[PDB]
Amino acid sequence: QPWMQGLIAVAVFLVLVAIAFAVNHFWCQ
Amino acid sequence: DNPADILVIAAYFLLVIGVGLWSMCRTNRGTVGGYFLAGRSMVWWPVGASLFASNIGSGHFVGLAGTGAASGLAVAGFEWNALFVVLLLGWLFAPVYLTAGVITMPQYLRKRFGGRRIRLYLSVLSLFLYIFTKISVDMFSGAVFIQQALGWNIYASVIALLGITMIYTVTGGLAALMYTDTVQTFVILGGACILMGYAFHEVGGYSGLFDKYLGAATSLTVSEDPAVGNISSFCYRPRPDSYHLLRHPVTGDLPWPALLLGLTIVSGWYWCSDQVIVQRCLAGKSLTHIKAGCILCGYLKLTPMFLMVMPGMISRILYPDEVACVVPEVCRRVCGTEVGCSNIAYPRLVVKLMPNGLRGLMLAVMLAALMSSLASIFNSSSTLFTMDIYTRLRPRAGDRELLLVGRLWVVFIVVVSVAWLPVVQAAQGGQLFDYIQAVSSYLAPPVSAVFVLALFVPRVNEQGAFWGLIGGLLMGLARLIPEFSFGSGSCVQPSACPAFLCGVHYLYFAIVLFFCSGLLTLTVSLCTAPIPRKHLHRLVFSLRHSKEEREDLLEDISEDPSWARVVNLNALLMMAVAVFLWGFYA
Ligand SMILES: OC[C@H]1O[C@@H](n2cc(Cc3ccc(C4CC4)cc3)c3c(F)cccc32)[C@H](O)[C@@H](O)[C@@H]1O
Ligand code: NA
Questions:
Q1: What SS3 state is found at B396?
Q2: Which of B572, B583, B584 sits opposite A17 (nearest CB)?
Q3: Residue B47, domain extent
Q4: N or C: which end of chain B has fewer CB within 10 A?
Q5: In a domain, B18, yes or no
Q6: What is the CATH number of the domain that holds B65?
Q7: CB contact, 8 Å: B84 with chain A?
């Protein structure tokens, strides 16, 4: 299904951006 | 010839004249700041509209529809890559260029590294890249569109187009083109949506495109010429991965690792390192405005799939014997090009589907696309030449002489492009859009490599950065030269080029070349004596918030917390929408 691939892609992207806020919050300050 | 077309073209010209006259009455073009950087006064919607309009030319209609017709929807990759890279411009590159206080990108390298020679090198390399990868595509795709839609002389019409854009460019500064680019972006999107609608009506909706495209083969697959014979089923049939962005990493026409890494590197240069795009961001009134402009430009950089790539696929569905012809005799009869007729995809939809009134609007779209791109290239090249090359030959020049030299360079680069028109008309069919992306992939990645190392790695010094650029061109030229030697041919007539030199996709060569130039720059940097911190305040991503006294080999980029918060959330929402759409068509 195209719609599931879209939602899964967004979900993986939101995981990466959550990781990016985690890493700079704990490892820049 | 129906009066409605002439009134639509005159109405378009009256809009462009009117916004030009208003910008000239408003802004100051007496100074170098005003004429070359719009006074650093351009709020978000001119910056976004101008980033979009400076990029989308007649090449985007002819090339993306054509390649859409020929190869399906992976070519949206070129446009959609841009979406990610514009956020590197607004959030990584643009802040450093505002705190460096630079008018040009060669000047940034002068301030960062400090020789006379990196600035001169990069200016001259940039000017060649604009003749080869920017002016060429606009002239060529303009001439395709005129040959097919109008039928006028493809020399005289290009001289006339190049001459009107000369006047439009020299008359106003960066403030006139960016306001005019807001009208041109409206016309481009407006008329391109109307053609998209007529096209999608003709195949019977979006369901229609995706159930009729893989069937859309020509019925004439037998040549009259011996040693061509029955054409292979591989070439005339549509590719069975036609509906997929993410195509096979060895046998795909645009391999997915090459699309994602290799286009990010080439888009790196195009959006983050290159005078044409970056002048729009050096003219923003502040960083929040640049960032907001970078969001608008991103949403507009989605539109080309739906407006160019899918309409080109509908052209194959509707005119398969003309757009998808494989027989050299038939392709020479259809558009004059023995190697194929993909390129007529977009201008056949305008001819066949548009009524009495809107054919004029679609001529205005191609004119809006052509003029905005050509004017942006002429103005940026004018800035490069004036402020890098002419201020070498005359240091005590002053802001009246530099504007005159600026305006005379636009005349000279127009004459150079008239000289260059026959060499670009030597490109036969959709070969040209492969050549431009190949030349971008062989010349741009060493520049992408030096800008990323200039911005993020303060150890990299002038010897490293210069010897990385020259090593970079030596490797790029190995591919480019031997290639252009062997030609391209077609799928019907494959070239005698050795597998080695070119089995490897040009966007894969982009990735190799980037890491080799980067590695050479880092290695020669780490061998030679470094640049200390007193030389580097506000020139590196680390030190864009410094306030300390730099020693030379607008400074304040702090924005309102609230508006920062707004544009930062909108960058994340625009990336979610990007990523969803890449998943949908993966
Ligand atoms: O260098 C990378 C940059 O390329 C720009 N760009 C895209 C096209 C359209 C296109 C592309 C490919 C093909 C054929 C398959 C090869 C036909 C058409 C284009 C052009 F035609 C001329 C000049 C630049 C052009 C994108 O806007 C930009 O986001 C991207 O960072
Ligand atoms: Na344009």
A1: coil
A2: B572
A3: 40-584
A4: N
A5: no
A6: 1.20.1730.10
A7: no
Q: Tell me, what amino acid is at B89?
A: L
CA distance B522 to B461: 9
Interface touch B575/A13, C-beta < 8 Å:
yes
B359 lies in a domain?
yes
Instruction: Tally the domains of chain B.
Output: 1
**A7–B583 CB contact, under 8 Å:** yes
Closest residue CA from atom 14 of ligand 1:
B433
Minimal CA–CA distance to B433: which of B488, B485, B483?
B488
- Put simply, the chain B residues between 552 and 581 with a CB less than 8 A from any chain A CB are 572, 575-576, 579-581
The alpha carbon torsion through A7, A13, A16, A17 (nearest 10 deg) reads -110
- State the structure-solving technique: cryo-EM
- DSSP-assigned letters across all residues of B121-146: HHHHHHHHHHIIIIIHHHHHHHHHHI
Angle at A24 between CA A19 and CA A27, to 5 degrees: 110
What distance in angstroms lies between residue B260's CA and the mean position of ligand 1's atoms? 14
> Are A14 and B576 inside 8 Å of each other by CB?
yes
Residue in B575, B583, B585 nearest the CB of A8:
B583
B481-487: long-range contacts at Cβ-Cβ below 8 A with a sequence spacing of 24 or more? B483/B438, B484/B435
Q: Is residue B437 part of a domain?
A: yes
- A5, B583: Cβ pair inside 8 Å? yes
SS (H, E, C) B281-328: HCCECCHHHHHHHHHHHHHHHHCHHHHHHHHHHHHHHHCHHHHCCCCH
Question: Could you give the C-alpha distances from B213 to B146, B240, B262, B318, in angstroms and in order?
Answer: 27, 10, 28, 9
For CA atoms B349, B352, B354, B356, give the dihedral sign: positive
Structural contact between residues A6 and B583, judged by C-beta atoms closer than 8 angstroms: yes
For B572, name the nearest residue in chain A, comparing CA atoms only: A17
Look-up of token digits 């990735």: B511
In a domain, B201, yes or no: yes
This structure's resolution (Å) is 2.9
